[PDB]
Design a protein around this ligand. Structure first.
Ligand code: CLA
Ligand code: CLA
Ligand code: CLA
Ligand code: CLA
Ligand code: CLA
Ligand code: CLA
Ligand code: CLA
Ligand code: CLA
Ligand code: CLA
Ligand SMILES: CC1=C(/C=C/C(C)=C/C=C/C(C)=C/C=C/C=C(C)/C=C/C=C(C)/C=C/C2=C(C)CCCC2(C)C)C(C)(C)CCC1
Ligand code: SF4
Lengths: 80, 192, 160, 203, 91, 41, 63
């Protein structure tokens, strides 16, 4: 549904994963930062699109980026 | 040397005839614009030096100024009096179609020269008296633009005297100035 | 000028003076002549008569409505309508703009530049509020010396 | 050196070399580098135009009060008729001011450049400092040369007499605006009743 | 008046300008500007069959390249000037 | 006064003291010189 | 790598808040493979409220 993209400006601060309320983001190993980890979005079909990860990203400009695309019953947040 | 002590710019070295360094606004700063400005400053000046005898000598001989000898074309009948004699072919569609043919053939043949120096001073057929093929060449070109800029300032004077004082000509502005010169100046135009 | 009669010879402007005192005179009829609210209306009438005799003596232009109109083109008769108090204004408004600009330069080279804007340093402020008196000589002086404007290489620019 | 305000620090730009320096730049109008070169030239024309101004405002009006010239007042001198038109004399002045000030403009910009004659170049001005055009046309008695301590005193006397004339001429201007009486008569109305002829009484 | 002489002389004046005066000015400009170009290619090169420049209609036998389109262009100005003159005279 | 004058130098107090002086001045201009539509000077 | 620690740099990154702004370098990572090693501290925060950001040496010049 929603497309969440991680860019190489990430410092591995992990707070995009901690702010995620639908378990989209996970921290995979990486070689481009001091923390040696970058975020990724394997369960991007579960993304509501709330951009809590973009609110918690301290990198200017943002490393996690959520693009609101086709919206399904996962990304609409319904219970009915 | 239009201002003693002023630094002349890098694009005005003094080797040009009349290169006095007068460019405060920097219009000739572009090199290819500056080559057109040098062949524009001379056609303008040569038309202006063909205009100052075309204004004063008709006025000094008594056939009116350059405005009242020009208002006949707006009139349906003016008959085109030349030296006090009406020419038979002096109709407005006749003399404009010749001017849009003869001058346009002259200006198109002028623009066809690829050399940027023969566009300035062609010579040859346009110099039959052989002064270009003489001992003095640089000072006569300085004589061209010093006389030319004087007539260019003169024609600017000629035009704005007609706007400020309609119905009068430049020798009639000279005769008005020669009577009481401390009362009738540009301050009559500046201060109404 | 612009089809407007002068207010000293305008019959509509004198009509508005007549119907304004008459409104205030009828307000005075229900008070005692030595009472305290009657002194306020009597001071209002003398304030009105001072106003109408001031508008006619300044060469104001009155239309068909009997109202003074301002000519802001820059007329030699009408300088005090727009040009004279505009130059008085822009001097005062440039004084506000020059002492606020010079305060920000004086606090940008400080230890905590953001605490000097919520808490304005009055000895630093009052020593340049006096200096805003001569500000056209200091604004064009900074313009000619290049200190008024900042070069675009040191200015935060949003991307295309 | 004495200063305009005791107990006040002199500004770093006014260091005391300039004739007439009393450390008086409270609003910082000559702080900038290269600016104090322009403000001395501005002071020198203004002081000399005011001493020319004070000799044409007060001296012919004083001799009118004695009655040996019968010259009109300076604020009504623009209404007086002459052999030339009053509007015409403005533009003839600013064509002559276009020459005299632009020769002065190049001296401030490029010093030592326009001391030579435009026509007969053997005639050269002997002035060395900026703003002091020594020569036969301007200093024929040669009083502008000598020791530097002696030259500083006579340059101090130009501007102290010049700043007084600036205040004088600015005073005559406001006196003729709110009282409409010439300024020698304003002096003679102040030696009769000084406590009743004051700026508050004239508003 | 004189419609048959005013129109003929004014068309012949503009065709004299088109053939002998402004023909190096026109032939240089139709080569410097060239054909109209979209995205680096000609409109006919991009696929428009209706944008092909005609060559049988432009096949001129004049030695200076003065074709029948230039007859229809410079002669059209000679009638525009010629009816400018006739309307101004008849007033 | 190392902190009382710091509070008095804050943004709302200095806006109140300046605009109290500013509106205090412009009212007192509008008493002795009222109905001023044209500057005579 | 990096220009210098404790030096004044100007950011050439277009999408940063501090583009054409004076910043102070506090840390340069000398480990290989790091894309943005130079840590630049700024006197002004961005809209997120932070002043610490990592840039490459290609996106900074000494000023
Ligand atoms: C249309 C007339 C014309 C044109 C093409 C030029 C062209 C030029 N002049 Mg100029 N000149 C002319 C009229 C002309 N002048 C007249 C009338 C004066 C006397 C006041 C002079 C006095 C003058 C001096 C003393 C010198 C030049 C020089 C220059 C050259 C560099 C400056 C420049 O780019 O000016 C560009 C100017 C124009 C394009 C004219 C139009 C300007 C605007 C559009 C209108 C202005 C209205 C006007 C103020 C009234 C260039 C060849 C310098 C040089 O090296 O000469 C070879 C030089 O030192 N000129
Ligand atoms: C740019 C140059 C130029 C231009 C376009 C004009 C234009 C004009 N002049 Mg003129 N003139 C010129 C230069 C020029 N003059 C000079 C240099 C002289 C000295 C020889 C004269 C002497 C002259 C006289 C004495 C008269 C004219 C007249 C005329 C008018 C009619 C000309 C005519 O019948 O053609 C004639 C064409 C041929 C002989 C070929 C026309 C408005 C007349 C005028 O002003 O109306 C009363 C007039 O009587 N001019
Ligand atoms: C080199 C050409 C030249 C010369 C010798 C003259 C000569 C004459 N003009 Mg002219 N004029 C000139 C250029 C010139 N002008 C230009 C370019 C302008 C535009 C600013 C005018 C604007 C103009 C007006 C509209 C008037 C004159 C007037 C005059 C007289 C001088 C009195 C005056 O106010 O001068 C003014 C001269 C200048 C402002 C510039 C002169 C520059 C030259 C090089 C010196 C005299 C008959 C007056 C006159 O006789 O009419 C009653 C008049 O009122 N002229
Ligand atoms: C410290 C003084 C200072 C200076 C010199 C200027 C000068 C500038 N500002 Mg302004 N401005 C300031 C204070 C200042 N401002 C403050 C306090 C605010 C918040 C109200 C703004 C809000 C602001 C806006 C909304 C706009 C400007 C703009 C402008 C420009 C034109 C003036 C204008 O629009 O009228 C002044 C505009 C106001 C809204 C009035 C505020 C001025 C206050 C009263 C001065 C306070 C100073 C004092 C020490 C505290 C100019 C570059 C315009 C621009 O983008 O540039 C072309 C524009 O759109 N400014
Ligand atoms: C336009 C007038 C003028 C100018 C050019 C200057 C220029 C100078 N004065 Mg000043 N001076 C003047 C008037 C002038 N004076 C008068 C009339 C007084 C007597 C009250 C003095 C008294 C004085 C002292 C005692 C000293 C100076 C000095 C200075 C120097 C530095 C300050 C500066 O740049 O001021 C620039 C000033 C202006 C640009 C004028 C601005 C006027 C504003 C716009 C309005 C003021 C309203 C007015 C009060 C009425 C500079 C050489 C110092 C120095 O070293 O001199 C060599 C010095 O110590 N001045
Ligand atoms: C810049 C300085 C300045 C200015 C504006 C003037 C200008 C004026 N003065 Mg004045 N004056 C000045 C300095 C000044 N004065 C000085 C230095 C003195 C000598 C102490 C005088 C002595 C003086 C006298 C004696 C008279 C004037 C008069 C004049 C008027 C015409 C001048 C004249 O007759 O042409 C002179 C032209 C020459 C070429 C010399 C004019 C209003 C006259 C006046 O008021 O009109 C009747 C008058 O009779 N002035
Ligand atoms: C109070 C008057 C006063 C004083 C003290 C001076 C003093 C000075 N001036 Mg100055 N000046 C003044 C008036 C004054 N000037 C005015 C009114 C003008 C305009 C006309 C000038 C124009 C001027 C120039 C442009 C030059 C000087 C120069 C001189 C210097 C040498 C001449 C001298 O000793 O003058 C003594 C002055 C008097 C005795 C006053 C006479 C008063 C009479 C009686 C009236 C000296 C620094 C010259 C210089 O420094 O060159 C190296 C120079 O060429 N001044
Ligand atoms: C050389 C300096 C100087 C001298 C000696 C005088 C002398 C005189 N002026 Mg004054 N005047 C001056 C400069 C000078 N003025 C300045 C700079 C201004 C412009 C703001 C005025 C504006 C002025 C007014 C409007 C009035 C006088 C008047 C007077 C007289 C009484 C003083 C008074 O009430 O006003 C003193 C006013 C001042 C602003 C003091 C400034 C003086 C310092 C030294 C500058 C007195 C004879 C009055 C008059 O007509 O007398 C009958 C009067 O109505 N003057
Ligand atoms: C930018 C807009 C603007 C402008 C140009 C003016 C300017 C003016 N108003 Mg104002 N006025 C405005 C907005 C404006 N007003 C607003 C927003 C209010 C409502 C709060 C008023 C209510 C107001 C009052 C109540 C008074 C003025 C007055 C004045 C004058 C001030 C004279 C003085 O010394 O003080 C002047 C003509 C006074 C005056 O003289 O009236 C002509 C006066 O009576 N005005
Ligand atoms: C010499 C020669 C020749 C011949 C040629 C010819 C003869 C030509 C002609 C030509 C012509 C014969 C042309 C014509 C043309 C025409 C045209 C082209 C027309 C057009 C028109 C128009 C278009 C107009 C318009 C209008 C209208 C319609 C109406 C309104 C107005 C107007 C006017 C605008 C040849 C080849 C043999 C060769 C040799 C030489
Ligand atoms: S919050 Fe931003 S900087 Fe931190 S790990 Fe996630 S994407 Fe990287």
């Amino acid at each position: 549904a929603h497309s969440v993209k991680i860019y190489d400006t990430c410092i591995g601060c992990t707070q995009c994963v901690r702010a995620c309320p639908t378990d989209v983001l996970e921290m995979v190993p990486w070689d481009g930062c001091k923390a040696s980890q970058i975020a990724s979005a394997p369960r991007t079909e579960d993304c509501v699109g709330c951009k809590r990860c973009e609110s918690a990203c301290p990198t200017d400009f943002l490393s996690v980026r959520v693009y609101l695309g086709a919206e399904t019953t996962r990304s609409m947040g319904l219970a009915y | 040397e239009w201002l003693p002590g002023n630094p002349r710019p890098s694009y005005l070295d003094g080797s040009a005839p009349g290169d006095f360094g007068f460019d405060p606004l920097g219009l000739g700063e572009v090199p290819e614009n500056l080559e057109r400005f040098k062949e524009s400053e001379l056609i303008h000046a040569r038309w202006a030096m063909l205009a100052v005898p075309g204004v004063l000598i008709p006025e000094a001989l008594g056939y009116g100024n350059w405005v009242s000898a020009q208002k006949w074309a707006a009139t349906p009948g003016g008959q085109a009096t030349y030296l006090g004699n009406p020419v038979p072919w002096g109709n407005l569609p006749v003399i404009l179609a010749i001017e849009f043919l003869a001058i346009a053939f002259a200006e198109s043949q002028r623009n066809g020269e690829p050399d940027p120096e023969k566009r300035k001073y062609p010579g040859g057929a346009f110099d039959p008296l052989g002064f270009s093929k003489g001992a003095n060449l640089e000072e006569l070109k300085l004589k061209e633009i010093k006389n030319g800029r004087l007539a260019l300032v003169a024609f600017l004077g000629f035009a704005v005297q007609a706007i400020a004082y309609p119905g009068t000509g430049p020798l009639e502005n000279l005769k008005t100035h020669l009577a009481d010169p401390w009362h009738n100046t540009i301050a009559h135009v500046i201060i109404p | 000028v612009a089809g407007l009669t002068p207010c000293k010879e305008s019959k509509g402007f004198a009509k508005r003076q007549k119907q304004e005192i008459k409104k205030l005179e009828g307000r005075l009829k229900l008070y005692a002549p030595d009472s305290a609210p009657a002194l306020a209306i009597n001071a209002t009438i003398e304030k009105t008569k001072r106003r109408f005799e001031f508008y006619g003596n300044q060469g104001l232009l009155c239309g068909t409505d009997g109202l003074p109109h301002l000519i802001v083109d820059g007329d030699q008769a009408h300088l005090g309508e727009f040009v004279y108090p505009g130059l008085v204004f822009l001097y005062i408004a440039g004084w506000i703009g020059w002492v606020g600009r010079a305060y920000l330069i004086d606090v940008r080279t400080s230890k905590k530049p953001t605490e000097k804007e919520i808490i304005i340093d009055v000895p630093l402020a009052l020593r340049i509020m006096s200096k805003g008196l001569t500000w056209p000589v200091a604004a064009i002086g900074e313009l000619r010396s290049g200190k008024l404007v900042e070069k675009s290489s040191n200015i935060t620019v949003s991307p295309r | 050196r004495p200063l305009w305000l005791p107990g006040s620090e002199a500004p770093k730009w006014l260091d005391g070399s300039l004739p007439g320096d009393y450390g008086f730049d409270p609003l910082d109008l000559a702080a900038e580098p290269g600016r104090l070169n322009w403000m001395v030239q501005a002071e020198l024309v203004h002081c000399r135009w005011a001493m020319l101004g004070a000799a044409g405002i007060f001296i012919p009006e004083l001799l009118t009060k004695i009655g040996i010239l019968n010259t009109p007042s300076w604020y009504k001198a623009g209404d007086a008729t002459y052999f030339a038109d009053q509007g015409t004399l403005f533009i003839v002045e600013l064509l002559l001011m276009a020459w005299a000030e632009s020769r002065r403009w190049a001296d401030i910009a490029r010093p030592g450049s326009v001391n030579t004659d435009p026509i007969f170049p053997n005639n050269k001005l002997t002035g060395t400092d900026v703003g002091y055009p020594g020569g036969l046309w301007f200093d024929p008695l040669g009083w502008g040369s000598g020791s530097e301590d002696k030259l500083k005193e006579i340059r101090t006397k130009e501007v102290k007499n010049g700043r007084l004339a600036m205040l004088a001429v600015l005073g005559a201007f406001v006196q003729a605006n709110v009282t409409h009486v010439g300024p020698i008569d304003n002096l003679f109305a102040h030696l009769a009743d000084p406590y009743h002829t004051t700026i508050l009484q004239s508003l | 008046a004189n419609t048959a002489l005013t129109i003929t002389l004014s068309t012949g004046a503009l065709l004299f300008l088109g053939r002998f005066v402004f023909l190096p000015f026109q032939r240089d400009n139709v080569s410097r500007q060239g054909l109209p170009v979209q995205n680096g290619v000609t409109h006919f090169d991009a696929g428009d069959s209706r944008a092909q420049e005609v060559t049988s209609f432009l096949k001129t036998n004049d030695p200076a390249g003065f074709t029948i389109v230039d007859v229809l262009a410079w002669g059209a100005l000679g009638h525009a000037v010629g009816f400018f003159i006739l309307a101004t005279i008849n007033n | 006064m190392q902190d009382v004058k710091t509070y008095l130098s804050t943004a709302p107090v200095l806006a109140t003291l300046w605009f109290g002086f500013l509106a205090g001045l412009l009212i007192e201009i509008n008493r002795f010189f009222p109905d001023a539509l044209v500057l005579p000077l | 790598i990096g220009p210098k620690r404790g030096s004044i740099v100007k950011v050439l990154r277009r999408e940063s808040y501090w583009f054409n702004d004076t910043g102070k370098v506090v840390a340069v990572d000398q480990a290989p493979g790091v894309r943005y090693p130079v840590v630049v501290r700024f006197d002004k925060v961005n809209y997120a409220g932070v002043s610490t950001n990592n840039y490459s040496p290609d996106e900074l010049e000494q000023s």
